[PDB]
């Protein structure tokens, strides 16, 4: 039925993976596909039909980029050393140098055919081609002439439309060297900077130097019969990145310092977000209250406003010397707290904000979870003479934590990797001094690792960041294999 048709793309795209190299993405496309066919075919595997399409997503877009990101740690992948070797040479050969002069060209139609002309500014003499036809790489020979070509010169728009075939025409003077298109009005003698023969040895065509791929550093370099070509290609470096993490002083010092802040930050968050969320959920669905329906939609508005924009509008409000918060905060009290300069005050801010962000989620959660409690428990409570505070602590609370745990342990891990908040609000907050790598006082483990990788000026080692990332995960994977 449809087995054969979708089994046609099995091999159609699969063998196209084997071809053109791509052995990285060749095995996984066939292996993860041959399971879907095997499962959806026979009926002895009816259970996996409901679990395949799900885990497929996990595999490709979650599990893969992780496994891959780990192999990144075993290499010097960096801003300097980024592309693969085959692209690095492809880039290096794509460049060129000017070895001749500049000639102003013109396009003059000759019937259905066209005609090119150049003009030498040094000698005054002009050169003209024979009636040719656009399409494909072709060489043209220019003959010297004194007369004008018949036909009105083609305007930019027309030459722009034929730029394609015009770039492949490699015209040449009788005496002068080869010359191709350089603009919409000019031809010039442009030639490839490097050439590549049998062996992977690149040779310069201007200074006449020879370069060889140094897989010790992942660059092209020269040796005496030293220079370093700096497009750069990625190459394997065993455990070099890992060993630096266990070695370096400037990396380790703040690493365990923020490990504290991260675990604390997400703890206080979870503790405050529940506290508020829950208390409200109680108050709002409390029978004797009036405008529940209004109160409800109001206390949810923060959640209906996209995080990033709320963080941003806050980022401004929390300005130290200006910004509306400290304006009013120096009106009543006589203080203007430094929410961006003082490590702690910054840390205090994060939490004031994050709490504003997270409470609705916990409240909504508690609201729904609160109805799992049969009314008659509170009726039996009110019989024994129980006040609001007595209810909350003896019935409500201890009856909500059980179903709440899995969700708050999950909320711990979310806030453990809350990248968006930090980068946006503070981006690490106040600076940590004496670090061989970029590190703030409010950076999270995700932030710190992101800093090392992408933040310009101060080392951009994707390999080192991949290492630390791998180091953390397997430790938290060990944490979750014991907790």
């Amino acid at each position: 039925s449809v087995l054969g048709l979708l089994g046609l793309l099995v091999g159609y795209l699969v063998v196209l993976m084997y071809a053109q190299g791509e052995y990285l993405f060749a095995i996984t496309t066939l292996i993860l596909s041959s399971a879907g066919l095997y499962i959806f075919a026979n009926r002895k595997a009816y259970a996996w039909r409901y679990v395949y399409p799900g885990m497929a997503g996990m595999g490709l877009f979650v599990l893969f980029p992780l496994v891959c990101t780990i192999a990144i740690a075993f290499t010097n992948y960096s801003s300097t050393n980024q592309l693969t070797f085959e692209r690095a040479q492809e880039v290096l050969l794509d460049r060129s140098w000017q070895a001749g002069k500049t000639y102003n060209f013109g396009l003059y139609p000759a019937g259905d055919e066209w005609q090119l002309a150049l003009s030498d500014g040094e000698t005054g003499k002009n050169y003209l081609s024979d009636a040719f036809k656009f399409g494909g790489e072709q060489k043209l020979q220019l003959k010297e002439t004194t007369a004008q070509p018949e036909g009105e010169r083609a305007n930019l728009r027309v030459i722009t439309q034929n730029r394609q075939a015009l770039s492949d025409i490699t015209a040449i003077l009788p005496d002068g060297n080869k010359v191709m298109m350089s603009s919409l009005r000019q031809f010039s003698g442009t030639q490839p900077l490097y050439t590549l023969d049998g062996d992977g040895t690149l040779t310069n065509n201007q200074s006449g130097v020879k370069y060889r791929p140094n897989n010790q550093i992942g660059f092209y370099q020269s040796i005496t019969a030293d220079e370093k070509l700096s497009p750069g290609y990625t190459v394997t470096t065993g455990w070099k990145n890992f060993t630096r993490v266990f070695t370096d002083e400037g990396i380790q010092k703040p690493f365990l310092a923020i490990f504290v802040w991260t675990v604390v930050f997400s703890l206080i968050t979870v503790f405050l977000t529940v506290a508020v969320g829950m208390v409200l959920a109680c108050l709002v669905q409390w029978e004797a209250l009036r405008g529940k329906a209004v109160y409800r939609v109001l206390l949810i508005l923060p959640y209906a406003v996209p995080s990033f924009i709320s963080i941003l509008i806050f980022k401004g409000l929390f300005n130290q010397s200006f910004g509306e918060i400290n304006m009013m905060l120096s009106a009543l009290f006589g203080v203007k707290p430094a929410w961006f300069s003082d490590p702690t005050t910054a840390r205090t801010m994060l939490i004031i904000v994050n709490t504003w962000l997270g409470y609705p989620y916990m409240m909504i959660l508690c609201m729904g979870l609160l109805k799992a409690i049969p009314d008659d428990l509170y009726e039996a409570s009110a019989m024994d003479g129980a006040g609001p505070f007595q209810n909350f602590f003896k019935i409500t609370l201890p009856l909500l934590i059980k179903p709440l745990t899995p969700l708050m342990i999950a909320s711990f891990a979310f806030n453990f990797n809350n990248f968006v908040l930090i980068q946006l609000l503070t981006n690490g907050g106040p600076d940590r001094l004496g670090t061989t790598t970029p590190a703030g006082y409010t950076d999270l483990l995700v932030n710190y690792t992101y800093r090392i990788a992408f933040e310009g000026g101060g080392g951009q080692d994707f390999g080192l960041a991949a290492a630390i990332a791998t180091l953390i995960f397997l430790l938290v994977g060990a944490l979750a294999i014991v907790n």
Partner: protein, 282 residues
């Protein structure tokens, strides 16, 4: 209507005030923006309450050029509306996909017996704790190859981002699984005796009774994508394909701080989820 003691109001009245004070404290920031979006000038600083209204910021947020009596017509800098539609695309499609994937899986975990079902989900949750933010490099790589093979889901494509979000379902699977293991077994057993195939049951019986939990998952997943930043701004390069989350940051270059223009679009950006929360009144 149980009879209530101690003048009741003592706490009832004192609660309306606390809640009333609370909404004020949490509304403040949001009322700040609305104010900034009506204050003339694009400055970072300005009077708390505008001296006089100014529609300018809302004009070029809707796509209207505005002619100031000074430097002629200044066109809208960013296609906020476009991005707004983009955010609703990637998120909407993304969520439906995620519920489809996780409600099928949960259904198999909660009913169908197959060895390793406990150690799978356990691994699922754990593998999902790893920050997608620490992958971008490998993620960029993936959609670079995947792109030229199947075009409509590579780099610079909305589909690219969508498919990237389809990964995270571990948490959802659990919740939906947990919800199923709550429904009456009989409704299904009785269906089985009625001759319904497992799917016939899933669709005709189990799903309709689960609407609510699916709705929560959807909404949760929707808000998620709407605000997702790291991955989205990694894959989307074209301004005309930016989502809100990406583009909304181009407003606040220090040397070109479009604070007012930004504020107007910000209020606008709080529309999608609000709509969902409002339609969620079913």
């Amino acid at each position: 209507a149980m009879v209530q003691p101690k003048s009741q109001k003592a706490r009832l009245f004192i609660t309306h005030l606390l809640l009333l004070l609370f909404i004020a404290a949490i509304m403040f920031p949001l009322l700040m923006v609305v104010a900034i979006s009506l204050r003339q000038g694009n400055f970072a600083t300005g009077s708390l309450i505008p001296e006089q209204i100014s529609w300018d910021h809302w004009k070029l947020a809707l796509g209207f050029s505005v002619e100031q009596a000074d430097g002629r017509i200044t066109p809208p800098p960013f296609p906020v509306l476009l991005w707004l539609w983009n955010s609703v695309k990637v998120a909407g499609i993304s969520a439906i996909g995620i519920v489809a994937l996780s409600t099928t899986c949960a259904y198999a975990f909660a009913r169908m017996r197959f060895p390793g079902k406990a150690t799978l989900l356990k691994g699922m949750l754990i593998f999902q704790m790893f920050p997608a933010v620490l992958s971008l490099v490998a993620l960029y790589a993936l959609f670079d190859r995947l792109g030229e093979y199947i075009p409509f889901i590579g780099l610079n494509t909305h589909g690219g981002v969508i498919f990237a979000y389809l990964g995270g379902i571990a948490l959802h699977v659990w919740t939906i699984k947990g919800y199923f293991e709550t429904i009456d077994s009989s409704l299904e057993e009785a269906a089985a005796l009625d001759g319904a195939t497992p799917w016939q049951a899933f669709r005709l019986v189990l799903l309709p009774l689960s609407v609510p939990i699916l709705a929560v998952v959807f909404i949760l997943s929707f808000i998620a994508a709407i605000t997702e930043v790291p991955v989205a701004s990694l894959l989307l390069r074209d301004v005309n394909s930016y989502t809100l989350a990406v583009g909304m940051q181009q407003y606040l270059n220090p040397q070109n701080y479009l604070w007012g223009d930004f504020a107007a679009a910000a209020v606008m950006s709080a529309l999608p989820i609000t709509i969902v929360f409002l339609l969620a009144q079913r």
